[PDB]
Design an enzyme around this catalytic site. Structure first.
Site, PDB file in Angstrom:
ATOM      1  N   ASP D 300      -7.307  70.576  80.975  1.00 12.11           N
ATOM      2  CA  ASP D 300      -7.982  69.483  80.724  1.00 12.11           C
ATOM      3  C   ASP D 300      -8.395  69.312  79.320  1.00 12.11           C
ATOM      4  O   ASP D 300      -9.072  68.473  78.879  1.00 12.11           O
ATOM      5  CB  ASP D 300      -9.031  69.365  81.652  1.00 12.11           C
ATOM      6  N   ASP D 347      -6.882  79.954  91.093  1.00 11.74           N
ATOM      7  CA  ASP D 347      -7.839  79.888  90.026  1.00 11.74           C
ATOM      8  C   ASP D 347      -7.311  80.694  88.658  1.00 11.74           C
ATOM      9  O   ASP D 347      -6.410  81.679  89.039  1.00 11.74           O
ATOM     10  CB  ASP D 347      -9.434  80.385  90.571  1.00 11.74           C
ATOM     11  N   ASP D 349      -9.145  82.974  87.143  1.00  8.17           N
ATOM     12  CA  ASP D 349      -9.375  84.490  87.184  1.00  8.17           C
ATOM     13  C   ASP D 349      -8.788  85.356  88.276  1.00  8.17           C
ATOM     14  O   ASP D 349      -8.366  86.293  88.178  1.00  8.17           O
ATOM     15  CB  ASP D 349     -11.054  84.599  87.742  1.00  8.17           C
ATOM     16  N   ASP D 421     -12.451  71.106  98.651  1.00  8.01           N
ATOM     17  CA  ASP D 421     -11.696  71.896  99.677  1.00  8.01           C
ATOM     18  C   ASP D 421     -12.296  71.952 101.001  1.00  8.01           C
ATOM     19  O   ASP D 421     -11.337  71.532 101.756  1.00  8.01           O
ATOM     20  CB  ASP D 421     -11.944  73.520  98.929  1.00  8.01           C
TER      21      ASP D 421
END
Lengths: 40, 45, 144, 780, 144
Positions: D300, D347, D349, D421
């Site tokens: 983004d 994600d 991480d 989610d």
């Protein structure tokens, strides 16, 4: 690595199909004529 | 009294009541185990 | 100087004095506090040599026995010497019965329990200090 | 004065005493303290035979036996501490091989008993062989008999002795059952906890409410309603994880041409390139056909370094014009351009292991109606495995696979709540689609996360659940089964556990302050009917979760964590109110000590019980501020230490085995077995083992710390990078009571340090008093 | 050695004395506090050699059994021998009925609870101190 994961659980029938290993083997047989001749 | 008579009968018996509780626990555990196994098989397959 | 190395304490005679205290509380003993203080001082005085201290203890053991005999109500040795013929006249079974009657097994059990308690408490409490304190207290009461 | 002692005492002993006094003084002992210490020492020497070898050994081991007493610094009341410790030493306790072997064999036999019983029931495989009507009749009569027996056991009046015997028997049965593994033991413990809790609730409703005083009646009703809510929450939690599904992967067809197409999405907003590079490298290393896997990076920030990396490694890259709806909107926009049959989201991480899709996609190829699969990012792990039984496993925001057509049919990822989610999972469930859950570790990357993350998730989740209930209420909806509604309501209730905690905090004060009888019963009966409830709940939760450390203290940790998040959750529907409540509790303690020393002896035991209750409250309250000061205190970064055998090759040809201590994108620090004179600045080769293969990475040693050697990677290639990420990240990977007491004490200390001054003084005085009192507590 | 670490404690006999304490709390024992104290001192007497300690315990086991028989209300050995002829003349079923009637399962349950509690306490807290304290307290009460 895969064997350790299959030992941490049951996973008795999930036969691992290593795409990377198969692709490297196919490339090796394409590049080296002797290996291609002997394998098939 | 239909319930006070029962309470008086079992008033001084902790061993018998504990045995009854254990029997009820085992029976309910078995029936729940059966039902949960059935539902698990219906879910996975 | 370092004279504290010669103040050895009562050691075994602590139990001696405790037993005499016990027999005095139950009323079985004729007690003379002054002689007991004298004996405590005689056993407590320091002597530089180990041999001299050991000789003092060995000599005082008969003196301790004599003091115990005096403190007890038993007849004097002269009576025993006079009545030895009568004592030998009695049969062995009669003497055994008499001594068994005389023996108070409750006091023997108390003596054994006191011995165990002394052998355990000698590691945690200075029994010499307390025995001397009680002996001085008894002397004080019997004097003033 | 020195003259007085010199003339009063002989010079040797005077010199000894003055030397001891000076030794005390040099260690900070005051003149009063040192004089008192000398007095106590001379008394001890004249009374206690400190010359004896036993006391010689005690003095030699003084620091071990008397940790809280400073011998070099005598203090006032030190003989009190010595007496306390001596009493503890006298009271406390200071063929072994055979007894230990027998006990271990007994424990092992208890553990292995379920397997033997399973084999015995396997040879008699077997109700299950009777007719429909016969089975219905037998089950009905069995259930009726068991329910009537349980009802009798719940509602039996007892005197203290019979009640105590009942408690001991049930507790022993629960302890014995807890040793046995398996689901049947968990079911037995669940039923036993239900019986005990029903007994407690029945007794509370029928024999503890006081109907004379209106105020005590209202307080009792409120407390009883709170206890009933807690019991309902516990029962729902038991229902949620009564039977973990333990789903296992379905093998894929051996024809690789029948496998589906997967699009991996890695969305990032402000994460540095170092974090996303590892995830992308792992994604390229996923064992799956190359023509059936497309990797997308969704940045983004429009950062050009990410675009350069995507172009270099070949993964796709899309950045949006606008930045509405955050991650959910980003994924929705990216979905308009993807063409795969399945959408996987990871994600930054998280590190996807190469066996992810192989172990996941089998169920999608097998069960058509399955639209979502979730993999673990303990308690959460088992709540998600239990939910899979009822088809209530919800999207956790990462490491999931979603079928493309159902996802596009529901209008994509929901964007109306902070937790997109959970709302996406709910919408998928509403249309009849099914969700699964596989409990196979990926690579888990990040370690610990600390409470900083723990609170991020805890909050963003509560707000999202509240919003979902507000807009897409599971109860008022259509197309959801009963068990799914129970799971969702259980989650909402878990996030609504704020008011009962306040009621529990205020009730003991409602006794001590207003002198009411909120719980109208003798204290002994209160203990005998409340303690089994808590003990059985703790045992059942410990058995279900299987935590290595398991006791009421973990429950106290859970309560203090959930009480720190109550104000935000209730806002979704600090200092001043909180210190007000803490001062209320301390005033309760003060009036309680007044009552205990001056009140009638009949109510003394009740006062003591309320004292214990208020002490528990004071622990929780301090824990809440302790976490508030410990949340922003973590300074360490990602550092995972794992043992893995590697090789180091020098230019000279010497090869040395080594174990990697720590690793990062900058390089690896390893521990070398044996002696090796590796010099810094020397180019060496690091050989890493991947399965049965070896990969060689050229490194230069940048730092040597003894046997610890740090190596840095020279500019790597793409395939070398993927091999590195496969060999490093995408791998196959009463004491608690004292700990909570320390947590509460340090929370109160921080409160004294940071509260308003007008209460800073009070809390500092209280902490000083508590420390002084603890200074006398016996220690081992 | 010099400081006499040979004060090991009663160990198992702690439970023995605890059972005696329970029975005296119920009234089934004709307690002999002096003999019990002598026996406890016999058990707590420190012995240097481990073989001597083991022999002391083995010899004390029949002494302890005889002491527990003495402190009970059961008939003495003479009465047991006199009634042995009647017991032999009685049928086996009568003996079984007498055994079933004599056994009080409540006291057996209490003894089991005491054993479990003693095991836990010995895992946490020394028992010899409390047992000896209670023995001395009973002896003090009996003496005065």
């Amino acid at each position: 690595d895969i064997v350790a994961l299959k030992q941490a659980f049951s996973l008795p029938d999930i036969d691992y199909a290593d795409i990377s290993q198969r692709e490297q083997l196919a490339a090796a047989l394409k590049r080296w004529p002797l290996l291609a001749e002997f394998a098939q | 009294p239909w319930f006070e008579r029962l309470w008086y009968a079992l008033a001084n018996h902790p061993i018998l009541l504990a045995v009854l509780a254990a029997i009820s626990v085992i029976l309910l555990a078995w029936v729940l185990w059966r039902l949960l196994r059935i539902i698990s098989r219906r879910r996975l397959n | 100087s370092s004279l504290w190395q010669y103040w050895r304490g009562l050691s075994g005679w602590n139990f001696y004095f405790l037993v005499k205290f016990g027999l005095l509380w139950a009323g079985y003993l004729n007690f003379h506090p002054l002689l007991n203080l004298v004996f405590a001082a005689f056993l407590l005085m320091p002597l530089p040599r180990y041999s001299l201290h050991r000789l003092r203890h060995w000599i005082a053991l008969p003196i301790g026995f004599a003091l115990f005999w005096h403190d007890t109500w038993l007849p004097g040795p002269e009576s025993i010497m006079s009545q030895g013929s009568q004592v030998a006249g009695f049969s062995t079974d009669y003497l055994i019965d008499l001594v068994t009657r005389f023996i108070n097994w409750q006091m023997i059990g108390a003596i054994f329990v006191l011995l165990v308690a002394w052998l355990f408490l000698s590691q945690w409490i200075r029994i010499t200090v307390f025995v001397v304190a009680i002996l001085l207290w008894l002397n004080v009461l019997t004097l003033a | 004065m020195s003259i007085l002692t010199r003339w009063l005492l002989i010079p040797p002993v005077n010199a000894r005493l003055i030397g001891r006094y000076r030794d005390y003084r040099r260690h900070g002992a005051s003149a009063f303290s040192a004089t008192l210490g000398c007095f106590w020492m001379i008394l001890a020497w004249i009374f206690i035979p400190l010359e004896h070898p036993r006391w010689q050994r005690i003095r030699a081991e003084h620091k071990n036996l008397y940790p809280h007493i400073n011998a070099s610094r005598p203090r006032p009341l030190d003989p009190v501490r010595y007496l306390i410790q001596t009493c503890w030493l006298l009271i406390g306790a200071s063929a072994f091989s055979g007894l230990q072997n027998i006990r271990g064999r007994y424990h092992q036999w208890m553990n292995e008993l379920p397997e033997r019983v399973s084999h015995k029931t396997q040879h008699l495989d077997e109700l299950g062989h009777l007719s429909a009507g016969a089975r219905r009749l037998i089950l009905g009569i069995i259930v009726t008999f068991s329910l009537i027996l349980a009802l009798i056991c719940v509602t039996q009046p007892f005197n203290p002795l019979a009640q105590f015997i009942f408690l001991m028997l049930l507790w022993g049965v629960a302890l014995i059952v807890r040793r046995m593994p398996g689901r049947f033991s968990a079911l037995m413990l669940i039923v036993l906890s239900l019986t005990v809790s029903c007994r407690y609730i029945w007794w509370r409703y029928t024999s503890t409410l006081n109907w004379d005083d209106p105020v005590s009646l209202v307080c009792g009703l409120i407390l009883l309603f709170a206890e009933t809510y807690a019991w309902i929450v516990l029962v729902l939690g038991y229902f949620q994880v009564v039977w973990p599904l333990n789903r296992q992967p379905v093998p894929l067809p051996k024809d690789m041409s029948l496998w589906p197409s997967v699009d991996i999405f890695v969305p990032t907003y402000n994460e540095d390139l170092n974090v996303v590079k590892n995830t992308i490298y792992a994604s390229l290393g996923i064992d799956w056909p190359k023509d059936k896997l497309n990797i997308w990076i969704l940045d983004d920030g429009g950062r050009e370094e990410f675009r350069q990396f995507a172009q270099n490694v070949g993964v796709k890259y899309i950045a949006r014009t606008t930045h509405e709806h955050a991650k959910a909107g980003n994924i929705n926009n990216a979905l308009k351009y993807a063409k795969g049959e399945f959408v996987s989201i990871f994600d930054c991480d998280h590190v996807p292991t190469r066996s992810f899709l192989q172990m996941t996609m089998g169920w999608f190829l097998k069960e058509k109606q399955l639209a979502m699969m979730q993999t673990p990012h303990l308690f959460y792990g088992l709540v998600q495995d239990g939910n899979d039984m009822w088809d209530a496993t919800f999207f956790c925001g990462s490491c999931a696979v979603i079928r493309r057509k159902p996802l596009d049919e529901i209008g994509g990822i929901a964007v109306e709540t902070v937790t997109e989610d959970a709302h996406t999972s709910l919408r998928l469930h509403r249309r009849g689609y099914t969700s699964a859950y596989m409990r196979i570790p990926q690579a888990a990357g990040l370690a610990t996360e600390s409470l900083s993350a723990h609170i991020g998730q805890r909050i963003r989740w509560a707000r999202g659940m509240v919003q979902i209930f507000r807009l897409d209420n599971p109860l008022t909806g259509k197309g959801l089964k009963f068990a799914q509604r129970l799971c969702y309501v259980n989650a909402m209730f878990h996030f609504l556990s704020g008011i009962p905690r306040l009621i529990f905090l205020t009730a003991p004060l409602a006794f001590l302050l207003l002198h009411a009888y909120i719980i109208y019963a003798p204290a002994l009966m209160i203990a005998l009917f409340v303690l089994p409830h808590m003990i059985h709940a703790s045992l059942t939760n410990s058995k279900i979760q299987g935590k290595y450390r398991h006791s009421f203290w973990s429950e106290i940790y859970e309560t203090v964590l959930a009480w720190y998040i109550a104000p935000p959750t209730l806002v979704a529907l600090i200092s001043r109110p909180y210190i007000f409540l803490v001062l209320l509790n301390l005033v309760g303690v003060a009036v309680g000590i007044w009552r205990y020393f001056y009140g009638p002896p009949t109510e003394m035991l009740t006062v003591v019980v309320s004292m214990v209750w208020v002490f528990y409250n004071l622990i929780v309250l301090g824990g809440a501020v302790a976490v508030s000061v410990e949340s922003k205190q973590v300074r360490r970064s990602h550092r995972v230490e794992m043992t893995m055998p590697a090789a180091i090759a020098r230019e000279d040809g010497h090869l040395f085995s080594c174990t990697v201590q720590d690793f990062s994108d900058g390089g690896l620090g390893i521990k070398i077995n044996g002696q090796a004179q590796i010099l810094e600045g020397q180019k060496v080769n690091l050989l890493l083992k991947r399965g049965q293969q070896e990969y060689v990475f050229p490194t230069q040693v940048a730092r040597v710390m003894g046997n610890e050697v740090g190596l840095k990677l020279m500019p790597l290639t793409t395939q070398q990078h993927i091999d590195f990420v496969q060999c490093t990240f995408a791998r196959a990977d009463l004491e608690s009571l004292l700990d909570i007491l320390k947590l509460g004490f340090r929370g109160y200390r921080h409160l004294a340090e940071f509260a308003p001054s007008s209460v800073k003084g009070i809390f500092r005085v209280l902490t000083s008093l508590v420390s002084w009192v603890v200074s006398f507590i016996p220690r081992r």
